[PDB]
From a paper:
Kinetoplastid RNA ([name]) editing takes place in the mitochondria of kinetoplastid protists and creates translatable mRNAs by uridine insertion/deletion. [name] is a 330 residue protein and contains two main domains, an N-terminal glycine (Gly)-rich region composed of GWG and RG repeats and a C-terminal RNA recognition motif ([name]). Unlike these editing accessory proteins, the T. bruceiRGG2 ([name]) protein is required for editing all nine pan-edited mRNAs. [name] binds RNA and modulates RNA structure and these functionalities have been shown to be to be essential for its role in [name] editing.
Author numbering: 199 to 269
C-alpha cells in the first residue's frame, strides 16, 4: 500500500534497478522497484516500518557517488 511506498530521487543517471534494490535492503525487504530516467524511482517494501526506516535512516545516503532524497 501507500504506507509501504517510498519515492527515491537524486540517483546517478547510470544507477540501475539492481543496484538501488541492493542499497535499500538496508531498509527492509523490497517488493517493488521501478526506476525512471534522471535518477528517480518508486519503491515498495513489505512493511510500513521498512518504508519508514528507508526515509528516516537512508535519507541523504550515498549511492554510486550520488546523494539520495527519499520521501
Amino acid at each position: 500500500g501507500s504506507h509501504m511506498r517510498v519515492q527515491v530521487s537524486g540517483m546517478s543517471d547510470e544507477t540501475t534497478w539492481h543496484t538501488l534494490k541492493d542499497h535499500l535492503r538496508q531498509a527492509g525487504e523490497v517488493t517493488f522497484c521501478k526506476v525512471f530516467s534522471g535518477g528517480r524511482a518508486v519503491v515498495e517494501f513489505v512493511t510500513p516500518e521498512d518504508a519508514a526506516r528507508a526515509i528516516t535512516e537512508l535519507q541523504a545516503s550515498e549511492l554510486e557517488g550520488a546523494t539520495l532524497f527519499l520521501r
